[PDB]
Write a protein that binds this ligand. Structure first.
Ligand SMILES: [Mg+2]
Ligand SMILES: [Mg+2]
Ligand SMILES: [Mg+2]
Ligand SMILES: [Mg+2]
Ligand SMILES: [Mg+2]
Ligand SMILES: [Mg+2]
Ligand SMILES: [Mg+2]
Ligand SMILES: [Mg+2]
Ligand SMILES: [Mg+2]
Ligand SMILES: [Mg+2]
Ligand SMILES: [Mg+2]
Ligand SMILES: [Mg+2]
Ligand SMILES: [Mg+2]
Ligand SMILES: [Mg+2]
Lengths: 159, 48, 293, 205, 170
RNA sequence: GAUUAGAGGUCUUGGGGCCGAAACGAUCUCAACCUAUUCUCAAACUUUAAAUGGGUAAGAAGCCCGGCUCGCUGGUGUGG
RNA sequence: CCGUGGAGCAGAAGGGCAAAAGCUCGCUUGAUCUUGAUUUUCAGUACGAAUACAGACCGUGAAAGCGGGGCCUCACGAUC
RNA sequence: GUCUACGGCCAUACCACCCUGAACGCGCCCGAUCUCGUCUGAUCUCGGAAGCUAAGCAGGGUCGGGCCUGGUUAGUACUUGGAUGGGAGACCGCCUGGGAAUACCGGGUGCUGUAGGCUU
């Protein structure tokens, strides 16, 4: 059977990208994580302290505790037929703010603003994101040039 | 007397016929596992 | 022969270091431990004091890091000393002390905290640390950024640190790198540190030159003679400089003069130019070779 | 001495090359991969003919050598001793294994190395012949009689390229005259308009 | 014309003696070297272990020292006087430095002491130029450009012009 | 990490010879070497790199205000 | 002089590392005392191993800091 | 137009050679009494200001290498789902969707934050 080591099969997952080894850029250290941010997990092999287990690599969780160097986050893990929301502590290098939430936040601010506006105007405005509707009817103008014929080319071997 | 060693052939069906329920998310989550000194502060603030 | 080391594969696989590391200006290993604030302090600034001794100047700044680039809140330059009285000798230990004190006083004066935390008005050169006064705003705290300088005993970065500490800033330190610490006895000589601060170590050098040689003395201190500074008066002029700094530490920017918009360096030539150049180079070579043949 | 070739015709296992893990591999029988007047320039052997595989399979190294020997024999018989240049374009890198029986049975049934084969894809060249223009039917017949030494199905194709190059013969001469490719050994060097002007001066001088 | 201070100056002179075995011979070689150079030299341990030369790992087998300035040109003058200001084309390196060896030491102005014995040594000189400290200073290190470096021909010209020596072919 | 083939350079060395007392002085060469090319490969190689797929979000437990508590952090009723 | 690591980091291999995690010196014993939480196999039980803290005593450094064993992945043991 | 101190992103910024740098600045540079450290004041530390853009550094150049970004390769390779499709097989064609990577050919060659100067 296999081995139950903590880092089995991570030679590519925890490795560094090509031509990106060396000193960790300081912007990663200079970011602020508060209680309740949605955050992504991406193990970085450069630092070995507080490295998350390989099964949380690429997972997104919620911050619930902030500490000197690390952050505690609640993340869902599918174990057999059930999902457990378990909390793990990850050092700040292996973490990154999720941009999936800021889009929704900006949308909230923007449609709240356009709801506050036009409230006095009384006009109607659409807020829900409708799915891509079918294309409407239109005209395709030929400019006096007729469409050119397309025919299959004859078979002839290359190799 | 050999025998089959390991399989997961029916496991997905077994899990799904009752459904993989997400954890019961709900407001006011517990405060266990939080930094002790920050917790001590929050207790003092609530007290006063 | 021999392999070519700087091979195309070598350049393909080569990974450059950071720009500051390539220029040699920044020690990122030290910067990581120096400018990084604890995560549970959130956006609480972590101030630090940058001291850089140049070939002709002393730079002292107060900075805290930000993602787009660390921001300078206060700065003080050694070449401002002639305004307060120090006309010459802008690099020595005394000048470092005055510029550190000026930076400290400028920060507090910008910052509305002069009447509190006056610090050592009378220079003693001994172990001094400021304590926060209850019912009043807390003392400013920062940490020294020695940079790439070798932190041996008697370094001018530590001189600037002492100057600001006497100014009133609360900077953790120990009296081990100040001039005066004696390794063997492991003791500190506050009087020796004081005379180094006030510049006597140059006064005895000039008197030593007086003892034997004159032309060598002129060669060593030419601008000193031009500015008419004598060994005895250096202590008095440094005291006057300290008094003036503590009196008026505010900085006024020099008025801006309108530019005449003159380009001093060659602009980048365009694709059309650099293509016409090679075209006419080929034409010229062909026309020269057809005759030379 | 060796097992029939039908026992190793299909690409059933992953490529299993000889390396620090697979040790003790016997040497492949084919050692020479080209012969004839290989020390010839590019402008005297314009005609090029390939034998192209039509099946995805694996060809034994020895069968490679046997086909090479047959083609070389017919060529020296027909177009003289040095009027051609052969090139086998398949190197046997995938070693095969054998679990010999002498009674353990199927226990511990991982085979020892036996021989080497080359895995061939659909439409991949097997052998290439370059020669003068007039020996076209000679090339075709040599490749046709070499076909009988291989399993599966193969085709003969007279390439439109010039010799063993990647340039079409109907403007190869024009391009070399214009000095866009410079002949060397048995091939050519492409000269793009990208180097320093010193090389351009050197080859236009 | 010329730049007044792109001129050639010697920046260090290295003396060494490799005896190949530790002991009384080694310390007496150190003594003669320090008497010659006016300063204490240092011992270099063997990098590896080879029994052909009868040496092992980490024992002192050579004594070397370096000098700059006044004493450097005095010692170099003594050495060239011993070598009658005669050098060969191959004595000069591609980087502009050069050097030679003296088979025995008492000729260049050292009194013969029978106890210490006799020792030869190697002289090497590293030709410099104002600004070469950029390559090795700490704060902002950098190269020394292409024009500013020294070549074999410049070293030859400097040697033959400043010390009016002769470069015999070889 | 395997791997075929020819090109151009030199003394950087070796091998057959040759004129040479000898001479990188010289003649061919075979080589190893270097520089551009060229044929064919990798489950325990890789600059690149899919399709299928694995998380997270798509609001009332949300946003926007005003004010209190804190023994924590604090240049600063600062930050949290 | 060139030298992006082609070396070394105890050991297998893989990952990681250049004013360092490598080499050489200086000083030391955070390999120390103590309650909890969490991860890894998992039944989501132990052992083992590991991760963030917190409370004392310290070490080191000018200091920021770093350190409660070994750069990480293994080197170990219930009841009576 | 540009520099210095501290930086962010870390080659569009690197590497090789060549040309030009007004002012400030950064440097090279001159010495070792004191502080400090070496075999050596070479490095480090300290005290200065005779000379110089030679070098570093900055700007520019190269039908430059590299790097970055496009086109081609290519709807090719591969691939989700489907068939009582073909074929002795090996494999291949079609339907429904997604869709690469070399060679080869183009373009570009650092942006920018805070504080402080010079261009009076
Ligand atoms: Mg059975
Ligand atoms: Mg069973
Ligand atoms: Mg340091
Ligand atoms: Mg049979
Ligand atoms: Mg199989
Ligand atoms: Mg270190
Ligand atoms: Mg503790
Ligand atoms: Mg260690
Ligand atoms: Mg000096
Ligand atoms: Mg310059
Ligand atoms: Mg110049
Ligand atoms: Mg280019
Ligand atoms: Mg700027
Ligand atoms: Mg004017």
């Amino acid at each position: 059977t296999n081995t139950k080591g903590k880092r089995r099969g991570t030679r590519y997952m925890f490795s560094r990208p090509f031509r990106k080894h060396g000193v960790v850029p300081l912007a990663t250290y200079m970011r602020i994580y508060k209680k309740g941010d949605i955050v992504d997990i991406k193990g970085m092999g450069t630092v070995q302290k507080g490295m998350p287990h390989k099964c949380y690599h690429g997972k997104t969780g919620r911050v619930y505790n902030v500490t000197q160097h690390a952050v505690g986050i609640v993340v869902n893990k599918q174990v057999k037929g059930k999902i457990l929301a378990k909390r793990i502590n990850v050092r700040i290098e292996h973490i990154k703010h999720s941009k999936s939430r800021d889009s929704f936040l900006k949308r909230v601010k923007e449609n709240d603003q356009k709801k506050k506006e036009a409230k006095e105007k009384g006009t109607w405005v659409q807020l829900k994101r409708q799915p891509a509707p079918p294309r409407e009817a239109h005209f395709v103008r030929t400019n006096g040039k007729e469409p050119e014929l397309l025919e299959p080319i004859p078979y002839e071997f290359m190799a | 007397a050999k025998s089959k060693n390991h399989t997961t052939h029916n496991q997905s069906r077994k899990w799904h016929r009752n459904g993989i329920k997400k954890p019961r998310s709900q407001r006011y989550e517990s405060l266990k596992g939080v930094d002790p000194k920050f917790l001590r502060n929050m207790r003092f603030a609530k007290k006063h | 022969f021999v392999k070519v080391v700087k091979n195309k594969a070598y350049f393909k696989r080569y990974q450059v270091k950071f720009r500051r590391r390539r220029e040699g200006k920044t020690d990122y290993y030290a910067r990581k431990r120096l400018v990084i604030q604890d995560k549970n302090k959130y956006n609480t600034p972590k101030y630090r004091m940058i001291v850089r001794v140049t070939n002709r100047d002393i730079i002292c700044q107060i900075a805290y890091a930000r993602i787009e680039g660390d921001m300078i809140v206060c700065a003080a330059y050694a070449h401002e000393l002639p305004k307060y009285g120090v006309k010459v000798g802008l690099t020595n230990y005394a000048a470092a002390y005055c510029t550190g004190l000026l930076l400290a006083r400028r920060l507090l004066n910008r910052f509305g905290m002069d009447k509190i935390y006056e610090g050592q008005v009378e220079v003693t050169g001994d172990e001094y640390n400021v304590e926060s006064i209850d019912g009043q705003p807390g003392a400013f705290t920062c940490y020294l950024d020695a940079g790439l300088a070798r932190t041996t005993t008697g370094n001018k970065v530590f001189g600037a640190l002492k100057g600001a500490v006497d100014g009133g800033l609360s900077i953790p330190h120990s009296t081990k790198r100040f001039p005066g610490y004696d390794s063997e006895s492991k003791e500190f000589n506050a009087e020796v540190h004081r005379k180094h601060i006030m510049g006597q170590n140059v006064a005895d050098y000039m008197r030593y030159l007086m003892e034997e040689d004159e032309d060598a003395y002129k060669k060593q201190f030419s601008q000193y003679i031009k500015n008419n500074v004598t060994p005895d008066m250096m202590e008095e002029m440094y005291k006057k400089a300290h008094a003036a700094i503590r009196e008026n530490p505010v900085y006024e920017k020099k008025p801006k003069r309108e530019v005449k918009k003159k380009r001093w360096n060659r602009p980048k030539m365009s694709l059309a130019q650099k293509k016409d150049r090679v075209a006419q180079k080929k034409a010229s070579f062909l026309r020269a070779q057809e005759r030379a043949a | 001495g060796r097992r029939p070739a039908r026992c190793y015709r299909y690409c059933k296992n992953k490529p299993y090359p000889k390396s620090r893990f697979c040790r003790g591999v016997p040497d492949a029988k084919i050692r020479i991969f080209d012969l004839g007047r290989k020390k010839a320039k590019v402008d005297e052997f314009p005609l090029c003919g390939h034998m192209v595989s039509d099946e995805y399979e694996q060809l034994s190294s020895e069968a490679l050598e046997a086909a090479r020997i047959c083609a070389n024999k017919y060529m020296v018989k027909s177009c003289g001793k040095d009027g051609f240049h052969i090139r086998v374009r398949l190197h046997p890198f995938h070693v095969i294994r054998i679990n010999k029986m002498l009674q353990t049975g199927m226990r511990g049934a991982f085979g020892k190395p036996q021989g080497t084969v080359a895995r061939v894809h659909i439409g991949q060249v097997i052998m290439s012949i370059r020669t003068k223009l007039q020996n076209k039917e000679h090339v075709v017949e040599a490749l046709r009689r070499a076909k009988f030494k291989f399993p599966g199905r193969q085709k003969i194709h007279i390439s439109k390229k010039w010799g063993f190059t990647k340039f079409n013969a109907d403007e190869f001469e024009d391009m070399v005259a214009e000095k866009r490719l410079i002949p060397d050994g048995c091939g050519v060097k492409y000269i793009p308009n990208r180097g320093p002007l010193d090389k351009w001066r050197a080859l236009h001088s | 014309k010329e730049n007044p201070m792109r001129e050639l100056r010697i920046r260090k002179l290295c003396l060494n003696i490799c005896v190949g075995e530790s002991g009384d011979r080694l310390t007496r070689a150190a003594k003669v070297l320090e008497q010659l150079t006016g300063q204490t030299p240092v011992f270099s341990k063997a990098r590896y272990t080879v029994r052909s030369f009868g040496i092992r790992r980490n024992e002192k087998i050579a004594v070397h020292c370096t000098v700059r300035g006044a004493k450097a040109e005095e010692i170099l003058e003594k050495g060239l006087k011993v070598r009658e200001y005669e050098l060969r084309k191959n004595n000069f390196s591609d980087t502009g430095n050069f050097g030679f060896g003296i088979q025995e030491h008492i000729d260049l102005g050292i009194k013969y002491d029978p106890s210490i014995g006799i020792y030869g040594l190697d002289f090497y000189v590293v030709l410099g130029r104002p600004g070469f400290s950029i390559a090795d200073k700490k704060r902002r290190t950098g190269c020394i450009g292409a024009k500013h470096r020294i070549s074999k021909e410049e070293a030859m010209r400097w040697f033959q012009q400043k010390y009016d020596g002769i470069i015999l072919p070889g």
